[PDB]
Structures are given as C-alpha cells and as structure tokens.
Amino acid sequence: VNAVHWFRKGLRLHDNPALKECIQGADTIRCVYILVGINRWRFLLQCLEDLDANLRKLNSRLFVIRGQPADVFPRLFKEWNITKLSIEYDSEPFGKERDAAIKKLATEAGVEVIVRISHTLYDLDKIIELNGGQPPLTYKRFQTLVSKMEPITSDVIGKCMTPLSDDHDEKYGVPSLEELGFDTDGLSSAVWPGGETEALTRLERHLERKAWVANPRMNANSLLASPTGLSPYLRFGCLSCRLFYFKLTDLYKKVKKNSSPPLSLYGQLLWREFFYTAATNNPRFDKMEGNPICVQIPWDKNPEALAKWAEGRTGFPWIDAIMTQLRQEGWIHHLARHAVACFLTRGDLWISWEEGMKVFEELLLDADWSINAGSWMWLSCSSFFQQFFHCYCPVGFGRRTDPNGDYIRRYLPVLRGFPAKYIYDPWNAPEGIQKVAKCLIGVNYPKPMVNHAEASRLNIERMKQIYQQL
Ligand SMILES: [Cl-]
C-alpha cells in the first residue's frame, strides 16, 4: 500500500528498476535521500536539487532527511505506514552492511525490501560465481568472464501519487552548501554541474561527438574538463551505465557496420565494473594491512611530503598543476592520475597509496569507496599484477602531454612567465629567466621536493627487491 524508494546512488529517474517495481501495487510513493570537500558536496546537492525539481514536475518531491538510516527508517515506517522499501543494489562492503541492517529492521516492521541491480551492467555476484567464488584479480580475466555473460519522456511515478505537506520545503528540502557549513564566497560556477538532467544532455552530445568529430588519442586539450565527460555522472548514478552502454553499442553499430565493437569502446564502463567486483566481498579493500589482494609494501610515513603533494607544492609543476586542477574542479584526466599517483607512491615519495586515496576521496568527483581504493592499488602496483619496472617522469610526461606547458600556466599562474623550455622544470632556468618570469625558484615557487633521478632509481630497485629476484 505505502511505499518508499531510497536514493543513495541511482540519483536519477531514468533506468530505475527498483523505483518502477516499488510502485507496482502501491497507493503512495515517497522517494527519500538520507544525508568531504566542497566540490563533492556541491555536486551531490545539485543532484538532489535536480531530482527534487524533476519529481516536482510529476507532482512529487524528493524527501531529504539528515540522519543515520538505522535511526530514521523505523519511525518513518511507522508514521507513513510503510510496507515496501526499494533500493538500487549497492555492491560496496559497507553499503551491504548498511543495507543488511536496514533489511533486518524492515523485516521486523513488516516491510518488504525490493532490491534491483542497476548501478552496474552486471550482477557482480554472478561474475564471482563464474570465477569460483573470488573476484578476478586481473582486468583481462574479468573481461573474459563478462564476455561469457550478457547477450525517457515518461512519468516514472505515473501509477502512483505522493502525499505532500505545506511545510515540505522546510522539513524535507535539499540543504544548501551554507547549511552544511561551507563558506561559499570562494566558488565560481561548477565546472561539473550535478544531476540527471545534465547527465542526459551530456550523453547526447557525447554520442554526437563519437559519431561526428570522431569514430581517440591524447592531446593537451584532453587535460581540461570536457563538456561531454560522463564519469562523475556515472559514479553518482545520474547517468545509467546501462543506458550509456546500450546507446554506445547501437550508435557504434549504426556508424560502423556490424562490428563486434572493441573492448576499448567500453573501457570506462568495464574498468569501473572490475573494481566494484574486486571490492564487493572485501571489507579491507581500502587497506594494505589485512587486505588479501594487496601486496604488502614498506611505505614511509612523511606527513610533510604528503601535504606538499596533496596541496600541489611539490616543486614539480606537472604534479602541482594536476593536484591544483583536482582541488579546484574535482576532475583530472586518467593519465594525470597515473602521474600524481605514481609520484606519491612507487615512483618518487614512497608514501602509501592509502594516503593518496584519502585525498582523492576528499576531492575527486568520480571516486567512490571501491573505485578509489582499486585505482590507487592499481596505480601504486599494490595489486592487479601491475608493472613497476617503469616510473612516470614528472617532467617528461607533462612535456609530452602538453608540449607548450599551457596546462601549467593555467593551474599555476605563478609560473605563467616561464618559457616552454623550462615550464616543466623551472629549477633549470637561468636566474635571469626566473627573474623575468617574476618567479624565483625557492622563493615564489618551491624547489622540487625530491631528486627525481635518484628517488625513482632507488624506489624501482626497492620495489624490485620486495619480490624474489631470479
Ligand atoms: Cl546508479
């Protein structure tokens, strides 16, 4: 009779099978959302504003509640006389633990829990069954398992109604950044605007781009936020990965013949799936110690080095530029992640991937518990059989990605006056050049915090020797 849909990810009305099923046989439906850096919070709140606005258009509203689910749902169930609760499935270990506790409470209150998988393409548990009860520990094996697996104008609440009270905006309104305790004087408009509406606009354009302008290699421009980038939208569920996957496939077929498209066309999607699968039964996935798939590495504790890196004050412009864009905007290119993750961990500073992961959790829009832990193990060569015999150069990688160094000048204006010859290694500029640039190295911008040549040589050696050498 009275039903609730509970938003956590899946922050969208399109491709929402849990919501659709929840509404079957229901008199009433209420959609609820139960409440570290400012960009993440802004993105979430914009998602919630978008949902509320779109629900409004259907004579509904989003119900935002501040509290712990375990403390909220029982009295909600009683007040509203709820007998059905639906959720999109969450594979993440702390998510499963949360949802297990809420199921217990719901069973206690006579409340049916409806669970549908739609944050991912696949049933992750079935992949694990196909692999003998443990996740594939290499991306290639995962690709093989899934190949042996698979083959918006409506009113999503049309069959139901939502009771609404006059004080809804007050009681159940989406909070503002200020209400969450943020200072807002220091924000321009978001580079990555939140919400389903935006996601669906970007999807169309994304697909237009793949068809028209393309049918894809790195250039300097790729380092900047694309207006057709989808990765934050996927992580929040603003864009269904299944919709994305289906649209891609059909357009590929339209444009290219039959063509059994390359795995590379689904790389974004499959890599995220791979880490969710790796994480789902591993409550220590975000740890080194006690984590069964993590190689144990003698990382060092250097809180000042970690802070220099986190803050973009390493003295390597390439690294600092990247960490500055990350903090300013909330997204950086996957190749830029390689650079700054390699620098912090196996390459230059020898600091645990756990520590890098924490910073990214605070700043990176498309990071969640599974993806972020997974990526950081991958980039530090702590898991997934990744190769540690090469170390990204914190000068050359940048110089090969943006030869002119505009990216540097863009995120590090203090360096704007250096010529391209020195913009990735300003410490090598003659002092007169530094002076013309109005930037003395050591004074206005720091010296490089490490000798890359030595650091990288020693660390590759030390990583090699953690393993038996033949
Ligand atoms: Cl989702």
Coordinates of C-alpha atoms and ligand atoms in Angstrom, one line a residue:
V1 CA 0.0 0.0 0.0
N2 CA 2.5 2.8 1.1
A3 CA 6.0 2.7 -0.5
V4 CA 9.4 4.3 -0.2
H5 CA 12.2 4.5 -2.7
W6 CA 15.6 5.2 -1.2
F7 CA 18.1 7.1 -3.2
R8 CA 21.9 6.7 -2.4
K9 CA 23.4 6.3 -5.8
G10 CA 21.0 5.7 -8.7
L11 CA 20.2 9.5 -8.4
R12 CA 18.0 9.5 -11.5
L13 CA 14.5 8.9 -12.7
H14 CA 15.5 7.1 -15.9
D15 CA 16.5 3.4 -15.8
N16 CA 15.4 3.0 -12.3
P17 CA 14.1 -0.6 -12.0
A18 CA 13.8 -0.5 -8.1
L19 CA 11.6 2.5 -8.2
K20 CA 9.5 1.1 -11.1
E21 CA 8.9 -2.2 -9.3
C22 CA 8.3 -0.5 -5.9
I23 CA 5.4 1.4 -7.4
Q24 CA 3.6 -1.8 -8.6
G25 CA 0.7 -2.3 -6.3
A26 CA 1.4 0.9 -4.4
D27 CA -1.1 3.6 -3.3
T28 CA 1.6 6.1 -2.3
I29 CA 5.3 6.5 -3.1
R30 CA 7.9 8.8 -1.5
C31 CA 11.5 9.0 -2.7
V32 CA 14.0 9.6 0.1
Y33 CA 17.6 10.6 0.3
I34 CA 19.3 10.3 3.7
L35 CA 22.2 12.6 4.5
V36 CA 34.3 15.8 2.2
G37 CA 35.5 18.8 0.1
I38 CA 33.2 21.5 -1.3
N39 CA 33.1 20.2 -4.9
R40 CA 31.8 16.8 -3.9
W41 CA 29.2 18.2 -1.7
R42 CA 28.1 20.8 -4.3
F43 CA 27.8 18.0 -6.9
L44 CA 25.7 15.9 -4.6
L45 CA 23.4 18.7 -3.6
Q46 CA 22.9 19.7 -7.3
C47 CA 22.0 16.1 -8.0
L48 CA 19.4 16.2 -5.2
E49 CA 18.1 19.6 -6.5
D50 CA 17.7 18.1 -9.9
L51 CA 15.8 15.1 -8.6
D52 CA 13.6 17.2 -6.5
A53 CA 12.9 19.5 -9.4
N54 CA 12.1 16.6 -11.7
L55 CA 9.9 14.9 -9.1
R56 CA 8.1 18.3 -8.6
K57 CA 7.2 18.2 -12.3
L58 CA 5.5 14.8 -11.6
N59 CA 3.5 16.2 -8.6
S60 CA 6.0 14.6 -6.2
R61 CA 9.0 15.8 -4.2
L62 CA 12.3 14.4 -3.1
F63 CA 12.4 13.8 0.7
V64 CA 15.8 14.8 2.1
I65 CA 16.4 13.7 5.7
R66 CA 19.6 14.3 7.8
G67 CA 20.4 11.3 10.0
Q68 CA 21.6 7.7 10.1
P69 CA 19.4 5.4 8.1
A70 CA 19.1 2.9 11.1
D71 CA 17.8 5.7 13.3
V72 CA 15.5 7.2 10.6
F73 CA 13.7 4.3 8.8
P74 CA 11.9 2.6 11.7
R75 CA 9.9 5.7 12.8
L76 CA 9.4 6.6 9.1
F77 CA 7.9 3.2 8.5
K78 CA 5.6 3.8 11.4
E79 CA 4.5 7.3 10.6
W80 CA 3.8 6.7 6.9
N81 CA 2.6 3.2 7.4
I82 CA 5.2 1.8 5.0
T83 CA 5.1 -1.8 3.9
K84 CA 7.6 -1.5 0.9
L85 CA 11.1 -0.1 0.7
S86 CA 13.1 -0.2 -2.5
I87 CA 16.8 0.4 -3.2
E88 CA 19.2 0.2 -6.1
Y89 CA 21.7 -2.5 -5.1
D90 CA 25.0 -1.4 -3.6
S91 CA 27.8 -3.9 -4.0
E92 CA 30.2 -1.9 -1.7
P93 CA 31.0 -3.8 1.5
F94 CA 30.0 -1.0 4.0
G95 CA 26.9 -0.5 1.8
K96 CA 25.9 -4.2 2.0
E97 CA 26.5 -4.0 5.8
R98 CA 24.2 -0.9 6.0
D99 CA 21.6 -2.5 3.8
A100 CA 21.7 -5.7 5.7
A101 CA 20.9 -3.8 8.9
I102 CA 18.0 -1.9 7.3
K103 CA 16.6 -5.2 5.9
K104 CA 16.6 -6.6 9.4
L105 CA 14.7 -3.6 10.6
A106 CA 12.3 -3.7 7.7
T107 CA 11.6 -7.4 8.2
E108 CA 10.8 -6.5 11.8
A109 CA 8.3 -3.8 10.8
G110 CA 6.5 -6.0 8.2
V111 CA 8.3 -4.1 5.4
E112 CA 9.2 -5.8 2.1
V113 CA 12.6 -4.7 0.7
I114 CA 12.9 -4.6 -3.1
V115 CA 16.4 -4.6 -4.5
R116 CA 17.4 -4.1 -8.1
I117 CA 20.8 -4.1 -9.7
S118 CA 21.3 -1.0 -11.9
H119 CA 24.5 0.8 -10.7
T120 CA 26.4 -1.7 -12.7
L121 CA 26.0 -3.6 -16.1
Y122 CA 26.2 -7.0 -14.5
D123 CA 25.3 -8.9 -11.4
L124 CA 28.6 -8.8 -9.7
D125 CA 28.0 -11.8 -7.5
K126 CA 27.4 -13.9 -10.6
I127 CA 30.8 -12.8 -12.1
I128 CA 32.3 -14.0 -8.8
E129 CA 30.4 -17.3 -9.1
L130 CA 31.8 -17.9 -12.6
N131 CA 35.3 -17.3 -11.1
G132 CA 35.0 -19.9 -8.4
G133 CA 34.0 -17.6 -5.5
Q134 CA 36.6 -15.0 -5.7
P135 CA 36.9 -11.9 -7.9
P136 CA 39.2 -11.8 -10.9
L137 CA 42.4 -10.3 -9.8
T138 CA 43.3 -9.2 -13.3
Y139 CA 41.4 -6.9 -15.6
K140 CA 41.9 -9.2 -18.5
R141 CA 40.4 -12.2 -16.7
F142 CA 37.4 -10.0 -15.7
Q143 CA 36.9 -9.0 -19.4
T144 CA 36.9 -12.7 -20.3
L145 CA 34.3 -13.6 -17.6
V146 CA 31.9 -10.9 -18.6
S147 CA 32.2 -11.8 -22.3
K148 CA 30.7 -15.1 -21.2
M149 CA 27.7 -13.4 -19.5
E150 CA 25.4 -10.8 -21.1
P151 CA 23.8 -11.5 -24.5
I152 CA 12.8 8.9 -21.1
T153 CA 9.7 11.0 -21.9
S154 CA 7.5 9.2 -19.4
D155 CA 6.3 9.9 -15.9
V156 CA 8.1 7.4 -13.7
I157 CA 5.5 7.9 -10.9
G158 CA 2.5 7.9 -13.2
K159 CA 0.9 4.9 -11.5
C160 CA 1.2 6.3 -8.0
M161 CA 0.8 9.6 -6.0
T162 CA 2.9 11.3 -3.3
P163 CA 1.3 12.8 -0.3
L164 CA 2.7 16.3 0.3
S165 CA 2.6 18.7 3.2
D166 CA 2.7 22.5 3.1
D167 CA 6.0 22.7 5.0
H168 CA 7.8 20.3 2.6
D169 CA 10.5 22.8 1.5
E170 CA 11.3 23.4 5.2
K171 CA 11.2 20.0 6.5
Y172 CA 12.5 17.9 3.6
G173 CA 14.2 20.4 1.5
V174 CA 17.6 19.9 -0.1
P175 CA 20.1 21.8 2.1
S176 CA 22.4 24.5 0.8
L177 CA 26.2 24.4 1.0
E178 CA 26.0 27.1 3.6
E179 CA 23.6 24.9 5.8
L180 CA 26.2 22.1 5.6
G181 CA 28.7 24.6 7.0
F182 CA 30.6 25.6 3.9
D183 CA 31.9 29.1 3.0
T184 CA 30.7 29.9 -0.4
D185 CA 32.3 33.3 -1.2
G186 CA 35.2 31.4 -2.8
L187 CA 33.3 29.5 -5.5
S188 CA 32.6 30.3 -9.1
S189 CA 30.0 28.2 -11.0
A190 CA 30.8 24.5 -11.1
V191 CA 32.8 23.0 -13.9
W192 CA 30.9 19.8 -13.4
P193 CA 27.2 20.7 -12.8
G194 CA 25.4 18.0 -10.9
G195 CA 22.3 16.0 -11.8
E196 CA 20.4 13.7 -14.2
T197 CA 19.3 16.5 -16.4
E198 CA 22.9 17.5 -17.1
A199 CA 23.9 13.8 -17.4
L200 CA 21.4 13.2 -20.1
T201 CA 22.3 16.4 -22.0
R202 CA 26.0 15.3 -21.9
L203 CA 25.2 11.8 -23.1
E204 CA 23.5 13.0 -26.2
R205 CA 26.4 15.3 -27.0
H206 CA 29.0 12.6 -26.1
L207 CA 27.4 10.3 -28.6
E208 CA 27.3 13.1 -31.2
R209 CA 31.0 13.6 -30.6
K210 CA 31.9 9.9 -31.0
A211 CA 29.9 9.7 -34.3
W212 CA 30.7 13.1 -35.8
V213 CA 34.0 14.5 -34.8
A214 CA 35.5 11.0 -34.1
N215 CA 34.6 7.3 -34.7
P216 CA 41.0 8.7 -29.9
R217 CA 44.4 10.0 -28.7
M218 CA 45.7 12.3 -26.1
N219 CA 46.2 16.0 -26.8
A220 CA 46.8 19.0 -24.5
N221 CA 43.1 19.8 -24.7
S222 CA 42.2 16.5 -23.2
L223 CA 43.6 17.5 -19.9
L224 CA 40.7 20.1 -19.5
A225 CA 37.2 19.3 -18.4
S226 CA 35.2 18.1 -21.3
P227 CA 31.6 19.3 -21.6
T228 CA 30.8 15.7 -22.7
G229 CA 32.6 14.0 -19.8
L230 CA 30.4 11.5 -18.0
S231 CA 32.5 10.0 -15.2
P232 CA 31.0 12.0 -12.3
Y233 CA 27.5 11.3 -13.6
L234 CA 28.2 7.5 -13.7
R235 CA 29.6 7.5 -10.1
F236 CA 26.5 9.2 -8.7
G237 CA 24.1 7.3 -10.9
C238 CA 22.9 10.5 -12.6
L239 CA 23.5 8.6 -15.8
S240 CA 22.6 4.9 -16.0
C241 CA 25.6 2.9 -17.2
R242 CA 23.2 0.5 -18.9
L243 CA 21.7 3.3 -20.9
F244 CA 25.1 4.6 -21.8
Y245 CA 26.2 1.0 -22.7
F246 CA 23.2 0.5 -25.0
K247 CA 23.4 3.9 -26.7
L248 CA 27.1 3.4 -27.4
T249 CA 26.6 0.0 -28.8
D250 CA 23.7 1.0 -31.1
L251 CA 25.4 4.0 -32.4
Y252 CA 28.6 2.0 -33.0
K253 CA 26.6 -0.5 -35.0
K254 CA 24.9 2.3 -36.9
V255 CA 28.1 4.1 -37.8
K256 CA 30.5 1.2 -38.2
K257 CA 28.6 -1.9 -39.7
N258 CA 28.3 -5.0 -37.6
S259 CA 31.4 -4.7 -35.8
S260 CA 31.6 -6.6 -32.5
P261 CA 33.0 -3.3 -31.1
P262 CA 36.4 -3.3 -29.4
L263 CA 36.6 -3.7 -25.6
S264 CA 38.2 -0.3 -25.7
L265 CA 34.8 1.2 -26.6
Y266 CA 33.5 0.0 -23.2
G267 CA 36.7 0.6 -21.2
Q268 CA 35.4 3.3 -19.0
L269 CA 32.4 1.1 -18.0
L270 CA 34.2 -2.2 -17.6
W271 CA 37.0 -0.8 -15.5
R272 CA 34.5 0.6 -13.0
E273 CA 32.8 -2.8 -13.0
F274 CA 36.0 -4.5 -12.4
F275 CA 36.8 -2.6 -9.3
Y276 CA 33.3 -2.9 -7.9
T277 CA 33.7 -6.7 -8.4
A278 CA 37.1 -6.8 -6.8
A279 CA 35.8 -4.8 -3.8
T280 CA 32.4 -6.3 -3.0
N281 CA 33.4 -9.2 -0.7
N282 CA 36.4 -7.4 0.7
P283 CA 35.7 -5.1 3.7
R284 CA 39.5 -4.3 3.9
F285 CA 39.7 -3.4 0.1
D286 CA 40.8 0.2 1.1
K287 CA 43.6 -1.0 3.4
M288 CA 47.1 -2.5 2.9
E289 CA 47.2 -4.5 6.1
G290 CA 44.7 -7.2 6.4
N291 CA 43.8 -6.8 2.7
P292 CA 44.1 -10.2 0.9
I293 CA 44.7 -8.8 -2.6
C294 CA 47.1 -6.1 -1.5
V295 CA 50.9 -6.7 -1.8
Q296 CA 52.5 -5.6 1.4
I297 CA 54.9 -2.7 0.7
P298 CA 57.1 -0.8 3.3
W299 CA 55.8 2.6 2.5
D300 CA 57.1 5.5 4.5
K301 CA 55.3 7.9 6.7
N302 CA 56.3 11.5 5.7
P303 CA 53.3 13.8 6.6
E304 CA 55.0 16.8 5.2
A305 CA 55.8 15.2 1.9
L306 CA 52.1 14.0 1.8
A307 CA 50.9 17.6 2.4
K308 CA 53.2 19.0 -0.3
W309 CA 51.8 16.6 -2.8
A310 CA 48.1 17.0 -1.6
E311 CA 48.5 20.8 -1.8
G312 CA 50.3 21.0 -5.1
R313 CA 53.5 22.3 -3.5
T314 CA 56.0 19.5 -4.6
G315 CA 58.1 21.8 -6.9
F316 CA 57.3 19.7 -10.0
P317 CA 54.9 21.8 -12.0
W318 CA 53.3 18.9 -13.8
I319 CA 52.4 17.3 -10.5
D320 CA 51.3 20.5 -8.8
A321 CA 49.2 21.6 -11.7
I322 CA 47.3 18.4 -11.7
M323 CA 46.7 18.5 -7.9
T324 CA 45.5 22.1 -8.3
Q325 CA 43.0 21.3 -11.0
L326 CA 41.8 18.4 -8.9
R327 CA 41.3 20.6 -5.9
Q328 CA 39.7 23.4 -8.0
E329 CA 37.4 21.5 -10.2
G330 CA 37.0 17.9 -8.9
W331 CA 38.2 16.1 -12.0
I332 CA 41.5 15.2 -13.6
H333 CA 42.3 13.1 -16.7
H334 CA 43.1 9.4 -16.1
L335 CA 46.6 10.0 -17.4
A336 CA 47.1 12.8 -14.9
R337 CA 46.0 10.4 -12.1
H338 CA 48.7 8.0 -13.2
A339 CA 51.2 10.8 -12.9
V340 CA 50.3 12.0 -9.4
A341 CA 49.7 8.5 -8.0
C342 CA 52.9 7.2 -9.4
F343 CA 54.7 10.3 -8.0
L344 CA 53.3 9.9 -4.4
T345 CA 53.7 6.1 -4.1
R346 CA 56.1 3.8 -6.1
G347 CA 57.8 6.5 -8.1
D348 CA 59.0 9.4 -6.0
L349 CA 57.8 9.8 -2.4
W350 CA 57.2 6.2 -1.3
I351 CA 54.1 7.1 0.6
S352 CA 51.2 4.6 0.9
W353 CA 48.5 4.5 -1.7
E354 CA 46.1 4.7 1.3
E355 CA 47.2 8.2 1.9
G356 CA 46.7 9.3 -1.7
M357 CA 43.3 7.6 -1.8
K358 CA 42.2 9.6 1.2
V359 CA 43.0 12.9 -0.5
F360 CA 41.2 11.8 -3.7
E361 CA 38.2 10.8 -1.6
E362 CA 38.0 14.3 -0.5
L363 CA 38.4 16.0 -3.9
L364 CA 37.6 13.6 -6.8
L365 CA 34.1 13.7 -8.1
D366 CA 34.1 10.3 -9.8
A367 CA 35.7 8.4 -6.8
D368 CA 33.8 6.2 -4.5
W369 CA 35.0 3.6 -2.0
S370 CA 35.6 0.8 -4.5
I371 CA 36.8 2.7 -7.5
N372 CA 39.1 5.0 -5.5
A373 CA 40.7 2.1 -3.5
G374 CA 41.0 0.0 -6.6
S375 CA 42.6 2.7 -8.7
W376 CA 45.1 3.6 -6.1
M377 CA 46.2 -0.1 -5.6
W378 CA 46.4 -0.3 -9.4
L379 CA 48.5 2.9 -9.9
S380 CA 50.8 2.0 -7.0
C381 CA 51.4 -1.6 -8.2
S382 CA 50.0 -2.9 -4.9
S383 CA 47.5 -5.2 -6.7
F384 CA 46.2 -6.5 -10.0
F385 CA 49.7 -7.5 -11.2
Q386 CA 50.6 -4.1 -12.5
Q387 CA 54.0 -3.5 -13.8
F388 CA 56.5 -1.5 -11.7
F389 CA 59.6 -1.5 -13.9
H390 CA 58.9 1.9 -15.4
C391 CA 58.3 5.1 -13.4
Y392 CA 56.5 8.1 -14.9
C393 CA 58.8 11.1 -15.3
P394 CA 57.3 14.1 -13.5
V395 CA 58.8 16.4 -16.1
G396 CA 58.7 14.5 -19.4
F397 CA 55.2 13.0 -19.1
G398 CA 53.9 16.5 -18.7
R399 CA 56.1 17.9 -21.5
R400 CA 54.8 15.1 -23.8
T401 CA 51.2 15.7 -22.9
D402 CA 51.1 19.5 -23.2
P403 CA 54.4 20.4 -25.0
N404 CA 53.6 24.1 -24.7
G405 CA 53.0 24.0 -21.0
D406 CA 49.7 25.9 -21.1
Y407 CA 48.3 23.5 -18.6
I408 CA 51.0 24.5 -16.2
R409 CA 50.5 28.2 -16.7
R410 CA 46.7 27.7 -16.4
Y411 CA 46.7 26.0 -12.9
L412 CA 49.9 27.5 -11.6
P413 CA 49.8 31.2 -12.6
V414 CA 52.9 31.8 -10.5
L415 CA 54.8 30.0 -13.3
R416 CA 53.0 31.8 -16.1
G417 CA 56.1 33.7 -17.1
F418 CA 58.3 30.7 -17.9
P419 CA 59.1 29.8 -21.5
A420 CA 58.1 26.3 -22.6
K421 CA 61.7 25.3 -22.4
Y422 CA 61.6 25.5 -18.6
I423 CA 57.9 25.4 -17.7
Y424 CA 58.1 21.7 -16.6
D425 CA 61.5 22.1 -14.9
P426 CA 61.8 25.8 -13.8
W427 CA 64.6 25.0 -11.4
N428 CA 66.8 24.6 -14.6
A429 CA 66.0 28.1 -15.9
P430 CA 68.8 30.5 -15.6
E431 CA 68.2 33.0 -12.8
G432 CA 67.6 35.9 -15.2
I433 CA 64.8 33.9 -16.8
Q434 CA 63.3 33.2 -13.3
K435 CA 63.5 37.0 -12.7
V436 CA 61.8 37.9 -16.0
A437 CA 59.2 35.4 -15.0
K438 CA 58.8 37.1 -11.7
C439 CA 59.3 33.7 -10.1
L440 CA 62.5 32.8 -8.2
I441 CA 62.6 29.1 -7.5
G442 CA 62.9 28.5 -3.8
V443 CA 61.1 31.8 -3.1
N444 CA 57.9 32.3 -5.1
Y445 CA 57.6 28.6 -6.1
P446 CA 59.4 25.8 -4.3
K447 CA 62.4 23.8 -5.5
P448 CA 61.5 20.2 -6.4
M449 CA 60.9 18.3 -3.2
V450 CA 63.0 15.3 -4.4
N451 CA 65.7 14.4 -7.0
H452 CA 63.6 12.5 -9.4
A453 CA 66.5 10.7 -11.0
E454 CA 67.7 9.3 -7.7
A455 CA 64.4 8.8 -6.0
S456 CA 63.0 6.9 -8.9
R457 CA 66.1 4.8 -9.4
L458 CA 66.2 3.8 -5.7
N459 CA 62.4 3.1 -5.5
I460 CA 62.2 1.0 -8.6
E461 CA 65.1 -1.0 -7.2
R462 CA 63.4 -1.3 -3.8
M463 CA 60.1 -2.4 -5.4
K464 CA 62.0 -5.0 -7.5
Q465 CA 63.7 -6.4 -4.4
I466 CA 60.5 -6.8 -2.4
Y467 CA 60.0 -9.7 -4.8
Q468 CA 62.3 -12.7 -5.2
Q469 CA 64.8 -11.9 -8.0
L470 CA 65.8 -14.7 -10.4
Ligands
CL1 CL 23.4 4.1 -10.3

